[PDB]
Design brief:
Two copies of one chain form a homodimer. By secondary structure, chain A is an alpha/beta fold. Chain A is built from four helices and five strands, in the order ββαβαβαβα. A five-stranded mixed β-sheet of chain A has the order 1-2-3-4-5, with helices on both faces. The complex binds chloride ion (CL) (6 copies). Chains A, B: It comes from Thermotoga maritima (strain ATCC 43589 / DSM 3109 / JCM 10099 / NBRC 100826 / MSB8).
C-alpha cells in the first residue's frame, strides 16, 4: 500500500530498516518524520536503522528529524543506528557531535550484529 | 523574576535579543527551547535575535532548537536572525546549509538595521 510505503523500508527480525533513496532535507524532512512516527514509532517499533547509502547530503532539517527519532527511541529504550553515511554526511555527523550519541555503522550486517547483541 | 529570566535577554523595539552566556547543547537544549516558546513565541513575540557570542560550539540538539524556532517564526511571518557565531559554529551553520535559510549577522547593530528595514 502506497502510503504505508511512502518511503522504502523493510522489517527484519523486529528491526525497521529505512532506506530513503533520495535526498533528506528541508523539502521532505517533515513528511519523512511524520511517516516514521506514524508508521513505526507510534506503533511500537522502536528498533530502527536509518540507512544513508543514497542520501547525498543532510541539512539542519534532516538533522532535526534524526534528533527527533533519537529522542523518541532513547525515551522508549529502543535501538537507533545510522548506517552507511557518505563522507559529506559523516562530516556533519562528526562536527555536530552526533557520532558521540548515536551508533553509526558502515554496513547493515554490522548494525544487525549489534542489535542482536 | 528568575524563571522569566532563566537565560539572559532583552527586548528592544519589539525584538527579543537572546544572549545565552553558556554552551547550548544536548544538556540544555530542551530547557532553552521550552523557555523561548513559553516566554516569547507563544506570547506573540516573533522577532528574535539569537546572539551566539558566548556559545563555544553547537551540536545536533542545539541545531534542532534553532530549526524549531525558525519553523515557528517562518510560520507566523516574523523575523529570525543568528548573530555573532564564532568560527566553529559558523562552520556547522555552513555545512548544514542553515546559512542559506536564516539571516546571519556579525553584530547586533547590523541585525537591528535589517529588522527596521
Ligand atoms: Cl518535522
Ligand atoms: Cl518542516
Ligand atoms: Cl510526527
Ligand atoms: Cl526540545
Ligand atoms: Cl531533549
Ligand atoms: Cl516548547
Amino acid at each position: 500500500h502506497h502510503h504505508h510505503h511512502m518511503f522504502p523500508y523493510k522489517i527484519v527480525d523486529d528491526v525497521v530498516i529505512l532506506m530513503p533513496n533520495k535526498e533528506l532535507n528541508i523539502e521532505n524532512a517533515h513528511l519523512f518524520k511524520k511517516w516514521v512516527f506514524d508508521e513505526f514509532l507510534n506503533k511500537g517499533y522502536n528498533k530502527i536503522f536509518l540507512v544513508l547509502s543514497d542520501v547525498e547530503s543532510i541539512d539542519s532539517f534532516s538533522l532535526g528529524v534524526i534528533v527527533n527519532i533519537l529522542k523518541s527511541i532513547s525515551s522508549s529504550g529502543g535501538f537507533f543506528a545510522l548506517v552507511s553515511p557518505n563522507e559529506k554526511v559523516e562530516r556533519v555527523l562528526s562536527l555536530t557531535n552526533l557520532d558521540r550519541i548515536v551508533k553509526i555503522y558502515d554496513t547493515i550486517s554490522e548494525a544487525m550484529e549489534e542489535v542482536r547483541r
